[PDB]
Design a protein around this ligand. Sequence first.
Ligand SMILES: O=C(O)c1ncoc1-c1ccccc1F
Ligand SMILES: [Cl-]
Ligand SMILES: [Mn+2]
Ligand SMILES: [Zn+2]
Length: 455
Amino acid sequence: SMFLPPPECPVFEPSWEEFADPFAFIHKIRPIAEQTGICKVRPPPDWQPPFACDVDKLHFTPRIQRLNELEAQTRVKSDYTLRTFGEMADAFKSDYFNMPVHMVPTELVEKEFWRLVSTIEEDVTVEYGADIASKEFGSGFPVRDGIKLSPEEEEYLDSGWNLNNMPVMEQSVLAHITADICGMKLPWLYVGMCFSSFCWHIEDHWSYSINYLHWGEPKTWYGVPGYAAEQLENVMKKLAPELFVSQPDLLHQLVTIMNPNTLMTHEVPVYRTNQCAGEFVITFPRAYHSGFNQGFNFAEAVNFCTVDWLPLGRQCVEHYRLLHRYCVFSHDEMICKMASKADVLDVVVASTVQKDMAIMIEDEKALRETVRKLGVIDSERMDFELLPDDERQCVKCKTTCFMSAISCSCKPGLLVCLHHVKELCSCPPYKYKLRYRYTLDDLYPMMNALKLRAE
Ligand SMILES: O=C(O)c1ncoc1-c1ccccc1F
Ligand SMILES: [Cl-]
Ligand SMILES: [Mn+2]
Ligand SMILES: [Zn+2]
């Protein structure tokens, strides 16, 4: 009636030993959590990272948000201090409910949220902070500067669960990517207020994400396991087709608020949780999620990729191609970068990269055979990684080229991937040129380095 809360997602309480390695722990819980899409992780009770900040010197620019179900919103991509915002946010919640803020039950805020977003009459708008860390506003976790740290801050400086360290460990595949893809591998900071929400979405390249609520009122999450992603997309194509009209930017993707009950009605499994201060939420690959904040709070989140993810990362790029969606980075460029550093790679990493590289190479062999039989004869090596990413997207499917592309003197600067050789210009095939990063004879040694390192 009105709102039936979805079943709770899994909640984990690792001992200090399990909690020690984040990647090991995630791999342990994965068979459970990937069935629900999201899961919650409660750190051991003494794991208590110091949060220190002055609420008066931290400034940020607020984003405005209208709260209407099925209305398109743009993915984030007139100035508050943390104190002035906190004052605005607490006054808002307190006035909305005529209650002291920490007396409004979470049950009620959830019910109320889904009421006001569905009611066309209500014109409720809220504000929020979302930005990567910077000089005006930095990580809520300890980092390193020319200012001195307390002995407890240094304890957490190198933690696995310090989300600054998360991308750059020897088990996050996104680590030794050197490309300038800052939105991806850097932590985002989120200042919430009551009802401020994050629309349904999956992470770029179907990465994991991990979210830490530093302090404040809870955050409410809904999640859908990765296997139900296309079920959910179908439900949303049916009820809100405007979100699916083609967009020209990776910054122009459209997303929306939608009642979990609507999804559950249409046989999509949804799970929920309330994330409280000091808890982590983890989202698995291609797991849809959305939610809202219960009140004033502060969260930090980062994307990451384990070896488990590599095959999905390839399937994701295939899927982007079939959608003509822009990529953040070249998956193949990443694989080859790792292969070229095979001597210093973690050995399970090296084993998994090798399996992905073997698929890459077989697929590339076939594609080159196909363009040869189409009459493309001339060819030259080309260092794709030197090109700005906007200078090496397939003109048809927008995939970021790295292994190979077709060019034509006829249309200077334009490229197509090998799936879209027909789509470049009208010249006969002999005017085309296969531009390639590597010959097959370069590639098999790179793969053998990986096999040696894995043994
Ligand atoms: O909150 C999330 O789960 C999320 N994941 C990627 O982007 C976001 C995101 C959401 C809302 C606002 C800005 C964002 F950046
Ligand atoms: Cl509304
Ligand atoms: Mn997300
Ligand atoms: Zn293409």
